[PDB]
């Protein structure tokens, strides 16, 4: 049994963004299935339980020290560590928190760890296992050195793609000959006319997906003015947007 | 008219601690009235409202843009500004943000400060006016550079003092000068010899006391380990803990 819950949805601004009343943010504040919160997942194969990043400020209330085994950070933005902040000065065993070599980290996370364990580096496209999962790390195209990861059990293959903006060429290719059933992919942007910097927008998308050629691609990190266009515009077939508490099953 | 809410009475590591199953984090637990959310306060001046730090994670709920005046932060440690990082990116004029000269402020909010404008900086022992609201800020003890404030109305003065372990000399004698009626203070642990470093401990805050003799001194920023001894001691007279929520007239 392998399965990812997305457990958030939305980048660092969120939806509803503060004191916004677009379309999109007055329905998240009415109909509360609508909030997205930071860009995070919640893996669980077989009995082991992994937290891909770490944006949610109630993790503490959620989970319990031991009740998982290890983080997987794409990146030390913000929005993708802020709820490590809560828990690190807790009671309990060294939790594993497995991310790229970024040096400096975020605030001083690195410095003051408490029960963190920051050294479980790894690299790109050097495979390492999960408690029976395989996970493989992929470079992104960020504004920070950021991961994202292919998860493989028994040939069914989950990619995890946030933070992005149209995908390293190696990346691309990689995840062209190892084809995922399942793609969680950031679109923060409605479609453009030119590329974004940071984020893709659904143009991106769609190019990458002609390359990668997955049969199911959900959308996540998704803004409120992406989903102000989404109420009005549908997305194509072989495309689904992402929201908080989604199930995906392999 | 003068009201201070304290928002938040705990520490970085807060009450309950995660995974702690001492008496205090315990009873935290089965009573979420017993919770410690970060050091953080309310003062309302009039129709006037400045939020003294920004540690909670749900400001974004509590208020709206435009629904508040000022924020005045009394340091940039992730605990007493992480609660910003929600809103920045919001939709509303600027709203200006007082509080010391911290060239680097924390991560990237002064590069990206979207609404927050952080130009209001502040000095040492120099007075400024929050909608009438006369506040001083004053220098602390502490790791990174950090104002508690003085705020002062036609009758009333209250102290601000978190986060800080014992008092700089100019600072204790501008309060024993000063008497604050009400004085908001760090203290983290139970008593302690010696030091601490960081934070006050319980004998730190009488010794303090002993100067400036303030009628009414609230404990905030509370360790876990200070609630459990509190359970079990009680404090001299004049002295009483903060709780979340507490409101000051
Ligand atoms: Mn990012
Ligand atoms: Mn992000
Ligand atoms: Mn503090
Ligand atoms: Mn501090
Ligand atoms: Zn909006
Ligand atoms: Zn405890």
Redesign the pocket.
């Given at each position: 049994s392998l399965t990812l819950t997305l457990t958030g949805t939305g980048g660092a601004q969120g939806?509803?963004?503060w004191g916004?009343?677009?379309?999109?943010?007055?329905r998240a504040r009415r109909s509360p299935q609508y909030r997205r919160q930071p860009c995070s997942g919640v893996v669980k194969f077989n009995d082991a339980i992994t937290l891909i990043d770490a944006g949610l400020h109630d993790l503490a209330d959620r989970w319990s020290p031991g009740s998982f085994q290890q983080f997987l950070l794409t990146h030390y933005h913000m929005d993708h560590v802020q709820g490590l902040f809560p828990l690190r000065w807790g009671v309990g065993d060294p939790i594993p928190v497995y991310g790229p070599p970024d040096e400096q980290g975020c605030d001083d996370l690195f410095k003051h760890p408490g029960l963190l364990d920051f050294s479980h580096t790894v690299e790109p496209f050097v495979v390492f296992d999960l408690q029976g999962l395989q996970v493989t790390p992929l470079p992104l195209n960020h504004s920070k050195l950021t991961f994202g990861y292919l998860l493989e059990t028994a040939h069914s293959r989950v990619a995890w793609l946030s933070d992005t903006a149209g995908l390293p060429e190696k990346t691309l290719k990689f995840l062209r000959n190892n084809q995922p059933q399942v793609m969680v992919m950031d679109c923060s942007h409605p479609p453009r006319a030119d590329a974004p910097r940071n984020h893709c927008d659904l143009n991106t998308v769609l190019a990458l997906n002609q390359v990668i050629r997955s049969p199911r691609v959900i959308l996540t990190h998704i803004s409120?003015?992406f989903?102000?266009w989404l109420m009005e515009n549908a997305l194509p077939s072989g495309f689904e947007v992402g929201f908080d508490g989604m199930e995906i099953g392999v």
């Amino acid at each position: 049994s392998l399965t990812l819950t997305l457990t958030g949805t939305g980048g660092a601004q969120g939806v509803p963004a503060w004191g916004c009343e677009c379309a999109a943010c007055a329905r998240a504040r009415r109909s509360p299935q609508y909030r997205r919160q930071p860009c995070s997942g919640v893996v669980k194969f077989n009995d082991a339980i992994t937290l891909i990043d770490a944006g949610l400020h109630d993790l503490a209330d959620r989970w319990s020290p031991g009740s998982f085994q290890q983080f997987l950070l794409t990146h030390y933005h913000m929005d993708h560590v802020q709820g490590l902040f809560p828990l690190r000065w807790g009671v309990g065993d060294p939790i594993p928190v497995y991310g790229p070599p970024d040096e400096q980290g975020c605030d001083d996370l690195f410095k003051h760890p408490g029960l963190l364990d920051f050294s479980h580096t790894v690299e790109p496209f050097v495979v390492f296992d999960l408690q029976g999962l395989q996970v493989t790390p992929l470079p992104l195209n960020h504004s920070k050195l950021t991961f994202g990861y292919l998860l493989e059990t028994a040939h069914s293959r989950v990619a995890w793609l946030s933070d992005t903006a149209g995908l390293p060429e190696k990346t691309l290719k990689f995840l062209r000959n190892n084809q995922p059933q399942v793609m969680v992919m950031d679109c923060s942007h409605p479609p453009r006319a030119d590329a974004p910097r940071n984020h893709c927008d659904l143009n991106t998308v769609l190019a990458l997906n002609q390359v990668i050629r997955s049969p199911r691609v959900i959308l996540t990190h998704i803004s409120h003015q992406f989903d102000a266009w989404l109420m009005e515009n549908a997305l194509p077939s072989g495309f689904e947007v992402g929201f908080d508490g989604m199930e995906i099953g392999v």
